[PDB]
């Protein structure tokens, strides 16, 4: 468990890899895989749908049970559900949907949830369907997270641009 391999280390606690989060989950067997969710735990495109599909939809049924009991999450909030076959647990975190003008400042709140967990395999919250700049998502992660976060970026082109943007931002 937690056998992460082939990451580039950006800070003492932030690692990045050009990889699909589901395939990493299957290789690594993490204690915590992070889902970039919405407040209803309705897993659409993006990481949520990729993770959900890999669980043969058990993730969405569990989420439906969670929501029926406790109601929707808040933006910036989270909940720990089961990791099924991918991880021990899945951290479901709701970043701001900047497409709907939700407060980008809640991206910081979202990443805070990471600090409740020694080690996580995570994507870049709000960076796809929710419309945030991926560079900005990385900046907020490295600035907010103090635990060990292994970031999976599947698109090689985004990953190269993200590394070169981080080198610039760290050196100023
Ligand atoms: N298989 C994969 N492995 C690794 N990285 C992947 C990936 N698939 C995508 N990414 C990238 O991960 C980041 C997060 O992007 P999104 O997955 O779209 O989450 P976001 O917070 O923007 O929106 C949440 C909403 O999306 C709905 O799925 C969810 O239910 C909610 O309504 C982006 O850089 C993607 F490019």
With respect to residue 130, please indicate whether it lies within any of the assigned structural domains: yes
Instruction: Look at strands 78-82 and 89-94 and give their pairing.
Output: antiparallel
With respect to residue 109, please indicate whether it lies within any of the assigned structural domains: yes
Cα of 14 to ligand 1 centre, how many Å? 19
What is the domain extent for residue 30? 8-171
Cα of 11 to ligand 1 centre, how many Å? 23
Whole-angstrom distance, CA of residue 98 vs CA of residue 101: 5
Whole-angstrom distance, CA of residue 123 vs CA of residue 151: 5
* Elucidated via: X-ray
With respect to residue 3, please indicate whether it lies within any of the assigned structural domains: no
Non-local CB neighbours of 110 within 8 Å, separated by 6+ positions = 75, 76, 77, 78, 93, 94, 95, 96, 125, 126
Give the experimental resolution in Å.
2.2
Atom of ligand 1 nearest to the CA of 125: 21
Q: Is 56 exposed, middle or buried (0-12, 13-18, 19+ CB in 10 A)?
A: exposed
Non-local CB neighbours of 131 within 8 Å, separated by 6+ positions = 97, 98, 99
Whole-angstrom distance, CA of residue 2 vs CA of residue 31: 7
| Nearest residue (CA) to ligand 1, atom 32 | 38
With respect to residue 133, please indicate whether it lies within any of the assigned structural domains: yes
**What is the number of structural domains in the chain?**
1
* CA dihedral (66, 69, 74, 76) positive or negative: negative
Atom of ligand 1 nearest to the CA of 123: 12
CATH of residue 39: 3.40.220.10
Cα of 78 to ligand 1 centre, how many Å? 16
Cα of 89 to ligand 1 centre, how many Å? 18
Cα of 61 to ligand 1 centre, how many Å? 20
Instruction: Look at strands 32-37 and 89-94 and give their pairing.
Output: parallel
Ligand 1, CB cutoff 6 Å, lining residues: 20-22, 36-38, 43-50, 95, 123-130, 134, 152, 154
Whole-angstrom distance, CA of residue 54 vs CA of residue 89: 14
Q: Is 99 exposed, middle or buried (0-12, 13-18, 19+ CB in 10 A)?
A: exposed
Residue 123 DSSP code: -
With respect to residue 2, please indicate whether it lies within any of the assigned structural domains: no
With respect to residue 71, please indicate whether it lies within any of the assigned structural domains: yes
Q: How many other β-carbons are positioned within 10 Å of the β-carbon of residue 125?
A: 27
Residue 43 DSSP SS3 = coil
With respect to residue 1, please indicate whether it lies within any of the assigned structural domains: no
Non-local CB neighbours of 107 within 8 Å, separated by 6+ positions = 76, 95, 96, 125, 126, 132, 136, 137, 140
With respect to residue 98, please indicate whether it lies within any of the assigned structural domains: yes
Residue 4 DSSP SS3 = coil
């Amino acid at each position: 468990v937690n056998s992460f391999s082939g990451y580039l280390k950006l800070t003492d606690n932030v690692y990045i890899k050009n990889a699909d989060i589901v395939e990493e989950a299957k290789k690594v067997k993490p204690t915590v895989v992070v889902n970039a969710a919405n407040v209803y735990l309705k897993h659409g495109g993006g990481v949520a749908g990729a993770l959900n599909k890999a669980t043969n939809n058990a993730m969405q049924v569990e989420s439906d049970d969670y929501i029926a009991t406790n109601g929707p999450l808040k933006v910036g909030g989270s909940c720990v559900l089961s990791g099924h076959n991918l991880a021990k647990h899945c951290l479901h975190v709701v970043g701001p949907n900047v497409n709907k003008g939700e407060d980008i400042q809640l991206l910081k709140s979202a990443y805070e949830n990471f600090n409740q967990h020694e080690v996580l395999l995570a994507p870049l919250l709000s960076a796809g369907i929710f419309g945030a700049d991926p560079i900005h998502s990385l900046r907020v992660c490295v600035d907010t997270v103090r635990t060990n976060v292994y970031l999976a970026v599947f698109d090689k082109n985004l990953y190269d641009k993200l590394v070169s943007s981080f080198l610039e931002m760290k050196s100023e």
